[PDB]
UniProtKB/Swiss-Prot annotation:
Temperature effects on activity: Optimum temperature is 50 degrees Celsius. Active between 10-60 degrees Celsius.
Protein name, per record: 3',5'-bisphosphate nucleotidase
UniProt cross-references to InterPro entries, sorted A to Z: Inositol_monoP_metal-BS (IPR020583), Inositol_monoP_superfamily (IPR051090), Inositol_monophosphatase-like (IPR000760), Inositol_monophosphatase_CS (IPR020550)
Species: Entamoeba histolytica (strain ATCC 30459 / HM-1:IMSS / ABRM)
Binding site for Mg(2+) 1: E69, D118, I120
Keywords: Cytoplasm, Hydrolase, Magnesium, Metal-binding, Multifunctional enzyme, Nucleotide-binding
Family from the record: Belongs to the inositol monophosphatase superfamily.
Length: 317
């Protein structure tokens, strides 16, 4: 009823993944960047991490399906070229296996055993040379069992990991053998809360979080940061609350944006719901289709915050 094996695999490959991303970042970023048709960026690093991880997962657990962000549908010839080369540093795949590996990420989730991957979470914070994450989780019937977040730029480079029921833990990117426990903060007044949110204005409503926090009488200004590294701040007590605020009722959050962090905050003693206080349902596919937005906190302040968020956002459509 424990998942030691799934968890040892994830720490192993998230840690290499981090080596892969730091080394991709050693070069100029432009000639390594693609603009998806939807306008979002994706880099040589995303494809390299996802090729390596799907390969390692598929070798070790031949029956599990993978849900991951990227695919090869369209991926320019010269980017692919560089992926290939970054990949062969860590495994012997020919350009063939690499494409096949990246394309294993097409599972629709739901029943059974699924791995959930963000090869680079917050790709923009990666071009920004600021916060970003390799995000891996393992679930069964939409219940998260293992979550790993590797964050090469946060406070020196840190890896946090949790399996269900067994607590939360922090590692250096350099040593995944020696970890420490990790518990959310004990902050009991919302006026003393440090709150966090995305840097991008398209990913969260920063005008309304201002309103919410001003009502909660928050003194300090938001720390704006990219990626699931926001869940990792909640979990280690560096931040108090984390808001992700929608502008409509039609955006559905991707499960590779939330699943690893979700379990890590809960194991470290906090609470994660949506903006109406409902628990996240990871069993309805590739997105959290029965949820609207995110509230992640240290548990102490959750309902107090949710009440004010419900209200500032009762007009979504
Ligand atoms: N309209 C949107 N609302 C919320 N999240 C989004 C939206 N569009 C894209 N995203 C996701 O936000 C993630 C990055 O969030 P962040 O790093 O917090 O800015 C990406 O992985 C996107 O999938
Ligand atoms: Mg990404
Ligand atoms: Na992402």
């Amino acid at each position: 009823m424990s998942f030691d094996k799934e968890l040892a695999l994830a720490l192993e490959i998230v840690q290499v993944s981090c080596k892969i991303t730091t080394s991709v970042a050693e070069h100029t970023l432009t000639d390594q960047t693609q603009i998806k048709n939807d306008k979002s960026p994706v880099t040589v690093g995303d494809y390299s991490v996802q090729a390596y991880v799907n390969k390692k997962i598929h070798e070790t657990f031949p029956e599990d399906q993978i849900v991951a962000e990227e695919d090869t549908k369209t991926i320019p010839e010269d980017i692919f070229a560089k992926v290939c080369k970054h990949v062969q540093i860590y495994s012997d795949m020919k350009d063939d296996e690499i494409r096949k590996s990246i394309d294993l990420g097409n599972s629709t989730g739901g029943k059974g055993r699924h791995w959930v991957l963000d090869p680079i979470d917050g790709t923009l914070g990666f071009l920004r040379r600021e916060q970003y994450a390799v995000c891996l989780a393992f679930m069964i019937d939409g219940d998260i069992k293992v979550g790993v977040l590797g964050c090469p730029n946060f406070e020196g480079g840190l890896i946090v990991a949790a399996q269900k029921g067994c607590g939360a833990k922090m590692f250096s990117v350099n040593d995944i053998k020696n970890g420490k426990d990790i518990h959310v903060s004990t902050t009991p007044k919302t006026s003393d809360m440090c709150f966090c949110e995305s840097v991008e204005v398209s990913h969260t409503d920063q005008s309304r979080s201002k309103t919410i926090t001003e009502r909660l009488q928050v003194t300090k200004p938001p720390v704006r940061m990219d990626s699931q590294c926001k869940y990792m701040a909640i979990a280690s007590g560096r931040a108090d609350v984390y808001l992700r605020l929608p502008r409509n009722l039609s955006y559905q959050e991707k499960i590779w944006d939330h699943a690893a962090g979700y379990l890590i905050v809960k194991e470290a003693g906090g609470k994660v719901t949506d903006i109406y206080g409902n628990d996240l349902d990871f069993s309805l596919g590739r997105t959290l289709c029965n949820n609207h937005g995110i509230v992640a906190s240290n548990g102490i302040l959750h309902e107090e915050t949710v009440n004010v968020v419900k209200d500032v956002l009762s007009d979504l459509k």
